[PDB]
């Protein structure tokens, strides 16, 4: 059918407003929910329906700044929300010590990402503190953790680290050699990329791996042509109509981006079947409340609404900005970032 | 102790044991974004959680408070971390915690924080005795649960429990030969034990797979395994495979088989085989068969593959 654009703009608007206690489990990931909504509006060219200034202040209130003594550098970055109870501070005063307050790699990523989308120039971001915190998250094997206190480690966070270094236009945030090693070691016998060595190759980790390399500008340098051909084969085999994340698994709207974006980075998305993909994505569109779901006749959420739209974007949907396949922001935004970077270089 | 849905539940603000603590509220400032509304009970538990956290109070009451915080939201990684801090400080019985996390994971098998918690516990105890069985149960409500398989590989690798995994794999593959997770597990076991260099093993595996393919010819997983264990040694270095496949084509055909064939032919052209120009034609003929009738959805891809072979071997 058709793309209910306005319906989706309202949907994202509501996401930025208030949610039912039913979404309590997203408390520590509120910043990424914000990202889905903001980048989603950006992708639909509707950022005007929100107060960029208010939101920018809220975001900055989530930054874990270094304290006076700077004894918490290894823990700087961004929080997913204010759940710890720290007094609201839009990165105005120095950081207030707290035994358990520290950033989360996915939040530092979506946070910076949101700031750029909203037009902020990142001047209030303590770049060095963030990079210091990032470094602290990398393990001996090259992968990353989400928080300094410890957590699981895998490709998801390698991608987060890559995006952070890229946006701050400084790769001192990671030991790139070790990260690349981790990404190579994750390639499966079936040629896809898994969350880690030995694990089942997966659409999500393949995107994270490939996108990370592209962000480092080392795709061609890390994988041979023969290897890239094998990876391309694995990826393009994911299309059933829409895309699934693993062989013999049902399709899921968000993979239209995870896999689709990987195919785009590998310059072969053009050889996929657009109609069946578009048709599937639209079949998961909630015509009443707006947004998209993973499967048709399923409830919509911010993640699928966003990735479903980015999926449509990949095929240049009428009414949607082109999405930067590696950075996960609109090309328009990736551009403003380019200018921003030039600015600093003076 | 006092369950959150107990008729006699009492807000922490009304509990005597907590009178000395000032609850700490959360504040999103002037204009909150993506604000979640919380019930009295919910906000109450967390206002006290913030209080205890802020003071890094390693008390028994704090430990009990985390149970409630977790019941309200098991996705709060900070709560689990603090709970681990307390588990140590109060030297709690870890075998008991194992029962706790076992119940939690069963209710929320797709939660990252709970699987991480269990892994930390197992490391602490250095006891993997109940892991394989626990995971097998979780895999019963979802044989493809990525968290379960990841945890399973960690345990097996960390405590070298390879002895029975290949058998577990054979069993699951019988339950559903299309489970891509099980095929990956099979490769995981073998490559970490015998390896595939033992021609006896390679032969057993190729034979095993061809058998599974014959039972269900349309199975990407089986084909990917077969190509996976041979692609690096050179697909063209196996003359009897090319023919055994061409013999299947008649009855057990599928786009996966045709694809395998194209791949064999390309390996040949890659190794300057005999009949360069003739082989390339056999390839191109298949590419087109894929594009026009066998794997139409990838029509443009296959034609792209074909054009690639032509401009590379002519």
């Amino acid at each position: 059918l058709d793309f209910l654009r306005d319906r989706h703009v309202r949907f994202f608007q509501r996401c930025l407003q208030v949610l039912p206690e039913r979404y309590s489990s997203l408390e520590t990931s509120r910043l990424t929910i914000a990202f889905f909504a903001l980048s989603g509006l950006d992708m639909l060219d509707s950022l005007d329906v929100v107060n960029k200034d208010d939101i920018i202040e809220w975001i900055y209130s989530l930054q874990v700044l270094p304290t006076e003594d700077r004894s918490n550098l290894d823990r700087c970055g961004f929080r997913g929300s204010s759940y710890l109870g720290i007094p609201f501070n839009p990165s105005k005063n120095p950081g207030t010590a707290h035994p358990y307050d520290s950033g989360h790699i996915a939040m530092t990523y979506t946070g910076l990402s949101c700031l750029i989308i909203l037009g902020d120039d990142l001047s209030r971001v303590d770049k060095e503190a963030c990079l210091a915190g990032l470094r602290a998250l990398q393990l001996e094997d090259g992968s990353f953790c989400a928080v300094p206190e410890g957590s699981e480690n895998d490709m998801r966070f390698v991608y987060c680290a890559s995006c952070i270094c890229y946006m701050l236009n400084n790769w001192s945030g990671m030991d790139m050699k070790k990260a690349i090693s981790y990404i190579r070691r994750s390639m499966s016998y079936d040629n896809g990329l898994a969350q880690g060595a030995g694990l089942e190759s997966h659409g999500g980790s393949t995107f994270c791996g490939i996108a990370s390399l592209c962000l480092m500008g080392k795709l061609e340098e890390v994988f041979s042509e023969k290897e890239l051909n094998r990876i391309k084969r694995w990826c393009i085999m994911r299309q059933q109509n829409g895309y699934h994340g693993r062989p013999n698994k049902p399709v899921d709207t968000c993979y239209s981006f995870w896999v689709g974006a990987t195919l785009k980075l590998l310059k072969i998305f053009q050889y996929t079947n657009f109609e069946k993909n578009r048709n599937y994505i639209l079949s998961t569109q909630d015509r009443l409340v707006g947004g998209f779901a993973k499967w048709p006749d399923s409830h919509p959420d911010a993640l699928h609404a966003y990735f479903g739209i980015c999926g449509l974007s990949l095929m240049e949907e009428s009414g949607i900005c082109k999405v930067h396949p590696a950075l996960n922001v609109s090309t328009r935004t990736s551009e403003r970032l380019r200018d921003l970077h030039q600015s600093w270089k003076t | 102790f006092l369950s959150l849905d107990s008729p006699t539940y009492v807000l922490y603000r009304d509990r005597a044991e907590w009178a000395d603590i000032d609850p700490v509220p959360q504040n999103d400032g002037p204009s909150p974004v993506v604000q979640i509304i919380y019930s009295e009970k919910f906000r109450d538990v967390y206002d006290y959680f913030r209080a205890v956290l802020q003071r890094d109070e390693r008390s028994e009451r704090a430990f009990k408070l985390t149970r409630d915080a977790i019941e309200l939201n098991a996705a709060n990684y900070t709560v689990w971390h603090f709970r681990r801090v307390l588990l140590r400080s109060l030297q709690k019985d870890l075998q008991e915690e194992m029962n706790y996390i076992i119940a939690i994971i069963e209710e929320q098998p797709k939660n990252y924080q709970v699987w991480h918690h269990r892994r930390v516990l197992v490391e602490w105890l250095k006891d993997p005795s109940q892991e394989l069985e626990f995971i097998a149960d979780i895999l019963n409500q979802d044989a493809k649960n990525y968290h379960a398989w990841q945890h399973r590989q960690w345990v097996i690798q960390e405590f070298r429990l390879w002895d029975n995994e290949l058998q577990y794999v054979d069993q699951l593959l019988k339950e559903d030969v299309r489970n891509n997770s099980v095929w990956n597990q099979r490769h995981f076991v073998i490559s970490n034990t015998t390896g595939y260099s033992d021609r006896a093993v390679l032969e057993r595996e190729v034979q095993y797979t061809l058998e599974m393919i014959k039972l269900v010819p349309h199975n990407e997983s089986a084909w990917n395994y077969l190509k996976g264990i041979l692609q690096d040694r050179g697909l063209s270095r196996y003359p009897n495979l090319l023919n055994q496949l061409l013999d299947l084509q008649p009855s057990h055909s599928s786009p996966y088989l045709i694809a395998f064939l194209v791949d064999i032919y390309e390996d040949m052209l890659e190794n300057q085989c005999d009949n360069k120009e003739d082989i390339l034609n056999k390839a191109l003929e298949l590419c087109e068969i894929l594009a026009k009738e066998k794997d139409t959805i990838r029509k443009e891809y296959w034609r792209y593959i074909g054009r690639s072979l032509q401009s590379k071997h002519s």
Binding site: S29, T32, A293, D301, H304 | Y112
Partner: peptide
């Protein structure tokens, strides 16, 4: 029916 990526 969702995708918990974190």
């Amino acid at each position: 029916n969702c995708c918990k990526v974190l």
